[PDB]
């Protein structure tokens, strides 16, 4: 039983993030618990302040006509309990609920460990025989406590796109709003545990330049390459199957190379030292002690810049 | 209280994918949230446009007779909320819901990392004392936003099989429809992280051809073989127990061999170099430096072609 | 309000497997979705065909008296929706529901990778002041689509034990039926990934017979034993704590030995080659090159036969 | 509307285990499905046998006053369906339900792989204005089929503590009962898979006593120590964070030591064999070939006895 | 229908922990099952003791007006069943429920294995046209059995913040309370399994100071470094992505270094022993046998103190 308007009835929206959590990078989802504030002139139940009762009359959802506000990008039926329904005299209804639903916002891992994200909550609403436009009321949209959590992410700002997008979806215009959660990752735990340790092995790898023992130069370059995989695997796991290239997926791959050519070298510092030509061998090995680290620091300044600087 | 027809009452269906996600390869399932659009002539509640009310009359599900449309291949009771029920004058009912259920579609890992899939949604409907045929209305079946997600898969097309299949299931014909979601995997993250790294170790493995040290030739071929298993395990994990052979399950197995005979060789470059016959040894070892890589690139072109080319 | 019989009211049962899946070996459970067909003479609501209405009258569950059919071996309250209730003239009721419940059938891993299983569904029913016998109607018991899934198992036959077992449970006879799902495992993925690779290492292990280097004979027999554990671990994991012996638990254990005595040998090919008695050492080592593989192929023919052949 | 007694109304309880399963060692819980039998004199609905109806009158739960019997140690609301309610003439009510709830009983891993447990089910009941004492009726308490499962545990006996404990909990005495499930673990799968394999490596470890190669003595003692961890990890995983010491946690830790001092020795059989004093070295190494295995079998008889013998 | 007060109606709260469990460090949540006790003067249903019925009148929730007490930091709708509602004469209502909900309290891993935590439960309550203040009644707040579990944590005290915090949230003051659960971890299983074993390898690592074999000095320092990662990985897994530094994340990282410079040394005890200057080499190697262990015990006393002592 919808409110007999004379034009498209506006519905005023607003989300108050109460909790944020379980941002699942693999899954590309996160869970939010928050307030949903709605309002509208249903002149149909205006009510003679003085003439009866009091300032504002409290209804149960069965009584009033209420607008169906479905969240767009959610796994399941949004799981909300109702808090208060308070109809003003002029027929103005005041609705508040407290949902908890896991949202399906996408993320851009193009800078992986050093990436900033922009999450989305949605809210369409289909029309019947009056048109429905939704729109935000910014006093119930300052939704974000001073407690918003979201483990391992710094949260930058909860804001929203004022102008809705109105579709025509199956011979009935709907109206969709865009609630925006900006977050930067707390890269860091990534250095002491991945970036650094992954670098350290790479160096030890090429300790085997100042060495002439093939036995201990493979027991060297090779023993480390193994352990690199154990990082490539560690990382490739807590991350999804991107169709593009990660930053750390780059430097983690660019690494693979400086092990191959490391191995190349020790390998040939030998079919060139057993070929009685240690003239050369100890010339090459002497060289790699510079070639490698430089082209690395060079290729990192090349790579690094290729991702952030552009 | 079903609609007194004069023949098999047609029910018009239609799914609008709103969300796609959590495609579980191990499980052979995926979760979808989407619109379900139904319609039918229940001439029984036709209604004198002019004579009363308005263009179309809105009912609650309790009032009207509504067709039971169960999804066939679903783990649990499909989890749907109703959106709108709008009966036209001629007795034509307009139904719309927004379900979220995890579907059990099978997948063919015969090309694993480079595989395209065709997912299914179903919708039977049992007859009572009128027969029920279901069928698709293609304006509520363009179901797929420009946001359909499905992480790590490119989505090719959401379409459907117009002609239903009508069974006789327990002395009551049912009618089943076939909704088709075509997807190709975003192979790629598979290279920098599996294909390539898995190749690199194989090479270093057989660096130990240009070597005469047994100590460092096993510390070589063997140290890498280990690391191969650590890939075979990595891969065998995020994949199910196929009764057939995978592509990467092939090349990952074909790999096992070039390590065995690598080991064979270094092993015999020794009971043949200690047997004072380095004549031969340094003949064999010299050979494997070609035999191996070739028979590999050969067996890959043989294998690769055996899977894609046929 | 139960049907006033003159003797034990028979209830006619019948299950139509619609879906099978998530057979959990560790858990010893599996999930099934399927039809449950019941029937009984409640002469109490017979109904004058001609005199009123039609052929058969449709009731809702609240109206009729319906027999409580609880599934015996289930984790939780069986999760079923009702499909149709159709009372015949003579007072014969026709009931059909579509449950989805996870069953707790035990399995016998005595042949692990090569094992056939017999799963169970149950259905007791307690008596009140008439006795209740249950029994199967085999036209609603041909329950098994041509789609029954059950990943990684071949399904042999869904059948049922006609003669129920009638208990006396707490001063009230109940009646239990036995629905049987026979399945064989798709052993196979077990070879290319476990059986074979697990064998291959065992062989390389004892390459160190044709070797005199202790350094590379331990770097040999030992480096493989490690990798065996990595299989014993892989397998012991996707399997439960049996109080008896598995097949593969056998050959996986029998394996442990041929590494110990392998190690024994290389170990003594040395305190016997450094003791200037290479007379003996190169006699023993020469021997093991036969002793081992034979006693293995022998102990496998012994073991294998001890499990399947008996 | 509770029964107007003249003293504390006794309620007669009784549990019939139908199923047992998913005993979760990490979680310290297990799931049970079983019958719950209750009874009491509600003289208030006594009923003139001859004067009307029959022997016993069947009620629905809404009609009668029924005692709230909550299970004490359960994760969630016990999940039960009702089976039969049968009021005797003298006002004696006969109640039966069939719940399935996961119980939170603690376990004592002090003898881990060889441990016997005693599980608990509870049943309090709060008083109102008559006091409620609960108590067991041992004919509905022989609850345990000849099918009770509980994978990987032998089940010894389902019994119960006749005398309830009556509390005063918040100005209202409650009454709690103690249902006891005694189980012994099927240790065994623990030997062929853990105990034994974990021993075998320890031996090979100290094959490196009959060796003089440091290269192959570390490639020895060390290669095995790794593999021990892989057991310590395997075990530490399918087990909780005990504040006390396990048996196998002991012997698994006592093991760590015989590797350290093994390493200590090989290590010093060298800074003592390169120090031209092979006099000593080959005296120590000669010794450890007895010292170790003995002090182990000794420290095991010491340890083993310290756990079971006391 | 809320109670016509003359000022802000106080609601008296109180939680009785019945169960605690599944504290998820990664997730930063834990599950609790407990009593929730509420009360308030609804003078509106005062009731003439003598004049009718008895001492106190029992209602069902539909009858009375009951305050909506939502838990603040919870994943989902708190899952509670009602136990008793008992209105006193003066209009004083007595409410009791038994909820089971998983709470989202944060944790501070800054001392990881040796850390004490303070968990939170919340309970807001929104006002309508009377204001609502909540507040604790400490006789239903002694909530904690002598059975509170919480595996692997010692539980210190369940207490609560008497003075609520009253917000203005969306033109309606709410009132929030703070229930505090203090727990210390049972560090320990962390030693025999992590701390110790992680140390032991580090030592063996630098056995390779009393060695001159490069072959067995890399087969030494390197073989252990690998095994360290296998701890860094073990630990990094059962812990979340902190934006700060852990204790064990420190010492686990500080460890990485003493392997690098260990490797540095053995590496240079060689390009300095092959450079015919064993003068120096056996001077350095001689040194590291003190430098290392000291700077470690020093850097641990430095580190350890940097975390606990400050
Ligand atoms: Sb190794």
UniProtKB/Swiss-Prot annotation, chains A, B, C, D, E:
One of its GO terms (molecular function) is extracellular ligand-gated monoatomic ion channel activity. Keywords: Cell inner membrane, Cell membrane, Ion channel, Ion transport, Ligand-gated ion channel, Membrane, Potassium, Potassium channel, Potassium transport, Receptor, Signal, Sodium, Sodium channel, Sodium transport, Transmembrane, Transmembrane helix, Transport. One of its GO terms (cellular component) is plasma membrane. Belongs to the ligand-gated ion channel (TC 1.A.9) family. Cationic channel with similar permeabilities for Na(+) and K(+), that is activated by an increase of the proton concentration on the extracellular side. Displays no permeability for chloride ions. Shows slow kinetics of activation, no desensitization and a single channel conductance of 8 pS. Might contribute to adaptation to external pH change. Homopentamer. The homologous nature of GLIC to eukaryotic nicotinic acetylcholine receptors and other eukaryotic pentameric ligand-gated ion channels, and its sensitivity to general anesthetics, define GLIC as a structural and functional model of signal transduction in the nervous system, also relevant for exploring the molecular basis of anesthetic action. Consists of an N-terminal ligand-binding domain that encloses a wide aqueous vestibule and a transmembrane domain that forms a narrow channel. This is Proton-gated ion channel. It comes from Gloeobacter violaceus (strain ATCC 29082 / PCC 7421). The lineage of its organism: Bacteria, Bacillati, Cyanobacteriota, Cyanophyceae, Gloeobacterales.
């Amino acid at each position: 039983p919808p409110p007999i308007a004379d034009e498209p009835l506006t519905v005023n929206t607003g989300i108050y993030l109460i909790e944020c959590y379980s941002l699942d990078d693999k899954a590309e989802t996160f869970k939010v618990n928050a307030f949903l504030s709605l309002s509208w002139k249903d002149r149909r139940l205006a009510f003679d302040p003085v003439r009866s009762g009091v300032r504002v009359k409290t209804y149960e959802p069965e009584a009033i006509w209420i607008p169906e506000i479905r969240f767009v990008n959610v796994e399941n039926a949004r799981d909300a309990d109702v808090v208060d329904i308070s109809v003003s005299p002029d027929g103005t209804v005041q609705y508040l609920e407290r949902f908890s639903a896991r949202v399906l916002s996408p993320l851009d891992f193009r800078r992986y460990p050093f990436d900033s994200q922009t999450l989305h909550i949605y809210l369409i609403v289909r029309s019947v025989d009056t048109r429905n436009i939704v729109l935000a009321v910014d006093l119930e949209k300052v939704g974000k406590n001073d407690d918003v959590f979201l483990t391992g992410w710094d949260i930058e700002s909860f804001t929203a796109v004022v102008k809705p997008a109105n579709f025509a979806l199956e011979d009935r215009l709907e109206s969709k709003l865009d609630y925006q959660l900006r977050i930067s990752r707390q890269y860091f735990s990534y250095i002491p545990n991945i970036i650094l340790p992954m670098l350290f092995i790479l160096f030890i790898s090429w300790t085997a330049f100042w060495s002439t023992s093939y036995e201990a130069n493979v027991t060297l370059v090779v023993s480390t390459l193994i352990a690199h995989i154990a990082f490539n695997i560690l990382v490739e796991t807590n991350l999804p199957k991107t169709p593009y290239m990660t930053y750390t997926g780059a430097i983690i791959f660019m690494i693979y190379l400086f092990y191959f050519v490391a191995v190349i070298e020790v390998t040939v510092q030998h079919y060139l030292k057993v070929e009685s030509q240690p003239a050369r061998a100890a010339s090459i090995t002497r060289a790699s002690r510079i070639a490698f680290p430089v082209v690395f620091l060079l290729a990192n300044i090349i790579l690094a810049f290729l991702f952030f600087g552009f």
